[PDB]
Write an enzyme that holds these catalytic residues in place. Structure first.
Site, mmCIF file in Angstrom:
data_model
loop_
_atom_site.group_PDB
_atom_site.id
_atom_site.type_symbol
_atom_site.label_atom_id
_atom_site.label_comp_id
_atom_site.label_asym_id
_atom_site.label_seq_id
_atom_site.Cartn_x
_atom_site.Cartn_y
_atom_site.Cartn_z
ATOM 1 N N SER A 50 0.688 0.526 -15.351
ATOM 2 C CA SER A 50 1.048 -0.871 -15.101
ATOM 3 C C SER A 50 1.903 -1.429 -16.280
ATOM 4 O O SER A 50 3.041 -0.955 -16.466
ATOM 5 C CB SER A 50 -0.222 -1.686 -14.837
ATOM 6 O OG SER A 50 0.126 -3.013 -14.481
ATOM 7 N N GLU A 84 -1.109 -1.573 -4.159
ATOM 8 C CA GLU A 84 -0.842 -2.177 -5.472
ATOM 9 C C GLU A 84 -1.187 -3.653 -5.539
ATOM 10 O O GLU A 84 -1.568 -4.117 -6.593
ATOM 11 C CB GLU A 84 0.632 -1.998 -5.871
ATOM 12 C CG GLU A 84 1.125 -0.544 -6.161
ATOM 13 C CD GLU A 84 0.344 0.144 -7.265
ATOM 14 O OE1 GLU A 84 -0.463 -0.544 -7.870
ATOM 15 O OE2 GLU A 84 0.513 1.368 -7.550
ATOM 16 N N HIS A 139 -4.799 -1.043 -7.679
ATOM 17 C CA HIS A 139 -3.991 -1.032 -8.895
ATOM 18 C C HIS A 139 -4.934 -0.554 -9.997
ATOM 19 O O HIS A 139 -6.042 -1.060 -10.149
ATOM 20 C CB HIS A 139 -3.511 -2.443 -9.189
ATOM 21 C CG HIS A 139 -2.452 -2.521 -10.248
ATOM 22 N ND1 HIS A 139 -1.155 -2.098 -10.038
ATOM 23 C CD2 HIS A 139 -2.490 -2.992 -11.521
ATOM 24 C CE1 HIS A 139 -0.439 -2.308 -11.133
ATOM 25 N NE2 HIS A 139 -1.226 -2.851 -12.046
#
Ligand SMILES: COc1ccc2c3c1O[C@H]1C[C@@H](O)C=C[C@@]31CCN(C)C2
Ligand SMILES: COc1ccc2c3c1O[C@H]1C[C@@H](O)C=C[C@@]31CCN(C)C2
Ligand SMILES: *[C@@H]1O[C@H](CO)[C@@H](O)[C@H](O)[C@H]1NC(C)=O
Ligand SMILES: *[C@@H]1O[C@H](CO)[C@@H](O)[C@H](O)[C@H]1NC(C)=O
Ligand SMILES: *[C@@H]1O[C@H](CO)[C@@H](O)[C@H](O)[C@H]1NC(C)=O
Ligand SMILES: *[C@@H]1O[C@H](CO)[C@@H](O)[C@H](O)[C@H]1NC(C)=O
Lengths: 522, 522
Positions: B197, B318, B431
């Site tokens: 990320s 996500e 995520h």
């Protein structure tokens, strides 16, 4: 005599014609207006002056002056839309098919032919009214109207070429019906006007225009609606094209009088030969503030229009015809696989008024990005683009707006590919080809349709005639009403009825709500 | 002694730890910079001054000062991301796991944690590096960097708070690996930086930045790329937010020095308490002209970046995590069906920078118009909107721009939903959740994963390590290279490896080519 009828304009002698081994009454080429020739050309029509004696009405009249398609010389698929009679500016006549014996006061249906407001004839084999008049016991009428420059040259402000006269022509034939259909067994209080494509746009225009509303009861619109992008132009654009027609013909462009007088001295084919040279369909209805009081969109939002029942719909492949005549890589003899290069120029060509962003939007909306160089997918996507933009979504926009105020809406999706269709299969269910079913051609064995196509034609006619007589296609398996909440419609094919909802919503939200917003901002 | 290592800044004493019934060396809490405290807050890091004696490296260091989430107090699915050590501005340390016995010169992997540049720790249970160092025979390093205003407050021009210092901390830790990793058994010439990320956006930023390029060999980017919309701002926006941080805290704003000095008097929590109040994530990297010479886009077109191999990818869902936390209608204990009103407001929030036209565009692109009120389709569409706009498409754009000049691209799509996920099923493959696999947590039995997960993990790890050592995840079932032509990628799940092409091309053309153009023109 069943054939001699007296009307407010004079006596008329119809002829007896055979229909599927029986017979009926036909009154062909009856005059409803004074020939718009000489200083009349371009002017609002005037009622036919009454005549003395008996008008011979046993034969089709002339077809109006118009561009004649020669792309495929002798091909029956193109040739069926061309004049099958001599062309003449003296063309304002109507035809009536009356069941024999003459009904007391039966349902009347008035046919308004299409042809993009630049062509069309009331006398085509596909508009032969004997099978419908006969099979459904209706008095069937086909009118005519001036097309091309002759019917739509618009010089707003001018009274010599005011614009919309082909429409007024239609209104005069309707007025004639209102005044005389009764002497033929027809009931003036029960007339349904119906047309296809430019003619369907016509019907919807008479639903709008205050001056036409009282001349019919109900309306049927086939693959055309008033708000179509190709069906009308501004007074400005109309003036601009009228001047450009003048420029092309060496006309003093000093004043409208100068211009108009020049155009009036020119022979017909002379206007027809330069007709296409003025585009940014050349001569179409104008939003004048008269036949149409305000913008089409505002009239529809306010409910300023005839409130009655309507029956309307589209065909599966509304766009293949035009792709074949105007876009790169299409052919009558090939499968017409379209490469990405052609696909792209094909969209630039289908949304002529759009900018780069607009074009990107259309492109992205109809491209499968996993398989962008697939020829069939590109062919079929261009077909949908043309059909969705020009016919289907404008019609769904109208169906939705109208239903908010109407008294009943019946929507259909015609997706049957005739077994004897002479056009290539990739073209699918073509624009114009639901007409032969509406007119019962499948009932005639020599035409070689299958047994189920006859069955299909028979319920299509009975739906149409029944709708004309009662406002509802069903006699008390059901075609449901279309409501703004449910949005139902039926398929029209040989298989058993299927009810669906929201015809092409996805793509139509794109064309009706989204794209216009995009072109506005940019 | 294997645990006693001498480095360029001083002796260090590690500790032997257990790993799946065996052991390896761990050097936890090694300083790589001077504590960025006092007058040093906001300044570039300064190299750690050499020490005497032996630094105790047997325990984890402090975590940097950051916002702590307690939306779900006690809940393991949110707490696993929060600081598990005390927080201090004295937080610039790194950790190393070295296989036992000590390799001569093995492959090095440097982990860079994410957390949106406002949070994150190197000491989390999911980033425990012993399983991977052990299983794949690599020397594993996790560094740290300042986050929040502490690491990204930017007042370009100033040299007291230049911005990007958190990126420079990462670079100082990389420099330290370069100079010292050899004494731990690591090959300074074979280091792979990898992160998820914000950490994945970081790895990509080091690929672009001229000053970081020589500090590593290859790069792995998990669910983030340099060009993410939330991953950087302009110097102006940087300054705007810096001044606005002072305002909320009543600071002299006459000049940067006045401001910075005020910002330097406030205790840590005071800055954090008002960090969110400056958004039009608050403090992120700045396109300053120094760490990044030009715009990220122009650097990617010109090929102004490190040329090497990259292995990168995304997870299936996500966006669900951010919808749970910031959108109306979502809950952790519900199936979270989203009304139409909420879906609308949810897109407005997901694409904060768009005008009304852009919003209509997004809505249309993600609404099934024949079932617009389906609550589940709305939840999933919003999930994909957030995931496509912030993670996936930005990454695909990166991937396509990089492959033009790179030396090998390996793309993945991770869609396995852990059998033991404590978060609700509607959130899918979240995520951050492929990390436990990359780090081998599925190898520890008490963790209760299935055996085909332990297997999945083992091949993920092997792919990661193999790629780190050779630039190819396959030892000579194969993962194909991603090429601008075929655009191949693999799925990463328990089933047998399938090869696909053009990951989410349809939506990504919309997000990467069409919407940007729509917005640029409106
Ligand atoms: C948009 O409407 C049209 C524009 C052009 C043409 C036709 C149209 O409708 C088609 C079917 C029928 O209405 C009459 C003419 C068409 C078929 C024959 N030609 C040559 C041209
Ligand atoms: C856009 O990146 C993020 C922004 C905010 C958060 C996270 C992010 O990445 C997520 C997974 C991991 O990287 C660390 C933190 C995250 C999960 C924990 N919280 C509370 C917030
Ligand atoms: C009407 O004109 C047609 C055309 O030739 C002709 O066949 C018909 O006999 C005419 N009717 C009469 C008797 O005038
Ligand atoms: C048509 O109009 C009548 C009243 O004039 C009304 O009662 C009826 O419900 C309407 N039908 C439809 C389908 O709107
Ligand atoms: C290292 O620090 C830990 C934790 O404070 C302590 O328990 C351990 O004994 C220390 N080791 C040495 C040799 O200082
Ligand atoms: C990587 O670069 C070298 C040239 O330095 C070349 O030989 C090799 O083919 C390249 N590999 C890829 C996958 O681009």
């Amino acid at each position: 005599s069943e054939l001699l009828v007296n009307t407010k304009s004079g006596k008329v002698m119809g002829t007896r014609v055979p229909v599927l081994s029986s017979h009926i009454s036909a009154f062909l080429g009856i005059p409803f207006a004074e020939p718009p020739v000489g200083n009349m050309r371009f002017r609002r029509p005037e009622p036919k002056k009454p005549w003395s004696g008996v008008w011979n009405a046993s034969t089709y009249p002339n077809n109006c002056q118009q561009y004649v398609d020669e792309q495929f010389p002798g091909f029956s698929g193109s040739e069926m839309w061309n004049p099958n009679r001599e062309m003449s500016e003296d063309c304002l006549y109507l035809n009536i098919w009356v069941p024999s014996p003459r009904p007391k006061s039966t349902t009347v249906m008035v046919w308004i032919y299409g042809g993009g407001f630049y062509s069309g004839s009331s006398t085509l084999d596909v508009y032969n009214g004997k099978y419908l008049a006969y099979t459904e016991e209706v008095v069937l009428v086909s009118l005519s109207y001036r097309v091309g420059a002759f019917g739509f040259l618009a010089l707003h402000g001018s009274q010599e070429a005011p614009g919309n006269v082909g429409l007024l022509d239609q209104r005069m034939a309707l007025q004639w019906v209102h005044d005389n259909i009764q002497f033929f067994g027809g009931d003036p209080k029960t007339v349904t006007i119906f047309g296809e494509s430019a003619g369907g746009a016509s019907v919807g225009m008479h639903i709008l225009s205050p001056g036409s509303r009282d001349l019919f009861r109900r309306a049927i619109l086939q693959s055309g609606s008033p708000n179509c992008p190709w069906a009308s132009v501004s007074v400005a654009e109309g003036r601009r094209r009228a001047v450009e027609l003048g420029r092309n013909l060496n006309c003093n462009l000093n004043s409208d009088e100068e211009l108009i007088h020049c155009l009036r001295e020119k022979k017909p084919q002379e206007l027809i030969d330069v007709e296409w040279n003025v585009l940014p369909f050349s001569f179409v209805p104008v939003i004048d503030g008269e036949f149409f009081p305000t913008s089409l969109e505002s009239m529809l939002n306010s409910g300023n229009f005839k409130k009655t029942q309507i029956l309307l719909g589209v065909n599966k492949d509304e766009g293949s015809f035009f792709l074949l005549y105007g876009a790169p890589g299409f052919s009558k003899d090939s499968e017409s696989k379209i490469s990405r290069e052609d696909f792209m120029s094909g969209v630039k060509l289908s949304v002529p008024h759009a900018n780069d962003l607009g074009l990107d939007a259309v492109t992205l909306q109809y491209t499968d990005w996993m398989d962008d160089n697939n020829g069939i997918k590109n062919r079929d996507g261009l077909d949908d683009i043309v059909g969705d933009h020009n016919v289907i979504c404008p019609l769904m926009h109208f169906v939705n707006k109208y239903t908010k105020f109407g008294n009943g809406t019946y929507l259909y999706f015609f997706n049957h590919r005739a077994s004897n269709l002479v056009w290539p299969e990739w073209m699918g269910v073509i624009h114009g080809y639901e007409i032969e079913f509406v007119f019962g051609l499948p009932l005639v064995k020599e035409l070689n349709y299958t047994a189920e196509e006859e069955a299909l034609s028979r319920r299509i006619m009975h739906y149409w005639a029944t709708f004309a007589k009662t406002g509802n296609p069903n006699e008390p398996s059901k075609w449901p009403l279309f409501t703004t909440k449910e949005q139902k419609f039926i398929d029209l094919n040989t298989e058993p009825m299927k009810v669906h909802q929201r015809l092409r919503v996805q793509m139509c939200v794109f064309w009706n709500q989204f794209l216009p917003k995009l072109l506005n901002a940019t």
